[PDB]
Amino acid sequence: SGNGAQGTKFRISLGLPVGAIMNCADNSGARNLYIIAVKGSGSRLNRLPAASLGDMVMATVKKGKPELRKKVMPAIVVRQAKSWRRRDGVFLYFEDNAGVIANPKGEMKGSAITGPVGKECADLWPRVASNSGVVV
Template sequence: MKGISSHISKTLIPGTILTCADNSGAKTLMIINKIGKSGAHGRLASVGIGDIVMASVKSGSPQYIKKKVRAVIIRQRSPVLRAAGMRLRFEDNAAILITDVNLPVATEVKGAMAREVIEKYIKLAGIASRVI
């Protein structure tokens, strides 16, 4: 997998509520844990843009409520420092649902998606409405 060309501040922790930015039927998600977690013993696994998480669906269509799903973070409120020196900040924390082989569940994304996600997961570019 290719490395990301920017410094992602990992500020989202388990328990954080995210907006589901796709048309899959889920509306809000709560982070349960990071997939492929690593870090200090006893410390919460923090995530940022481009990371895959296990999440619980808090609201949305009945087929998703109270289900555990895989999601990838596409926006975060905390600034991301890009290699050119530009800082990127979004107005909300958002994720989209993915399958076990990192393919999107939905057919379109509402709102913007960070370029760092596209660098990591090329297949998600097909459903993005805007890439920033």
């Protein structure tokens, strides 16, 4: 995350390392996002920088519209599909990995989100919560 964080986030189990391809949930014309970096990740020998729900990543559009391909852009993870624990102790997970496109300040490139988003992401990014249909 980093700059555009609205508050802090509890540790969510990391599910999306570098090289992961997730679905592109918004209506910006991109089909999938390919994660090349995680904002705020630490440094360890041989350890891959991994992303969780609500994290801001750097991503490229591998499949989609040609004006979105072949460049790096920030993205926000909204669906994780690797099970994580909340402080009320429910273990929950979606069925796919999904993110949306944003600028470095966090406002969405698109306008609407298809499918659910996590509340740990909706609380942390208000534009995602603004364009989100259902928040769970």
